[PDB]
Each structure stands twice: as C-alpha cells, then as structure tokens.
Amino acid sequence: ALDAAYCFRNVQDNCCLRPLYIDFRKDLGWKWIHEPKGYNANFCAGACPKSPSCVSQDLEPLTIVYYVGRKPKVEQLSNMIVKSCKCS
Ligand SMILES: [Ca+2]
Secondary structure: OEEHHHHOOOOOOEOEEEOOEEEHHHHHOOOOEEEOOEEEOOEEEOEOOOOOOEEEOOEEEEEEEEEEOOEEEEEEEEEEEEOEEEEO
C-alpha cells in the first residue's frame, strides 16, 4: 500500500504518505492534551493518474492523556494518524 514503509524510503512526485509532526499546544491551540506533546499525523499528496485526488485511506487512533482537574485520564482518539493513502 501507499504507506510509510514504501513512501518514506523512495522520494517521488506520485501520490504517497508524507511525514508531518503536529504539536498539540503550539499548532492546534489545544490545552486539553498533556501527553504526548505531539504526534505524527502525516498526510497525503502527489500526482494521481476523471482525475483522482491523493487522499487518506487507512486511519489509526492515538492514545492521549487529558486532565479532569489534576487527575490524569487516558483515552483513545480515533482517526488521528494517516497510515496510508490512495487515489480516488
Ligand atoms: Ca475515544
């Protein structure tokens, strides 16, 4: 698939997964997530052979930490990480 294993290895103008690190506090303005400080969300871009767009395919969740007062709470966020792309 058009995932990290294939794309991050060989550069190409074609549709592929692209690295992208997001800092929750600094980029999104989020004060809610205390751990991790950020994560690799990645994204999709590139030439597609109608004329498709390079878009996400499979998504993965992210486990984070938020607070109710001072108390740490664990929670799985859905659709946070892009693991593969596709032409559609
Ligand atoms: Ca959840």
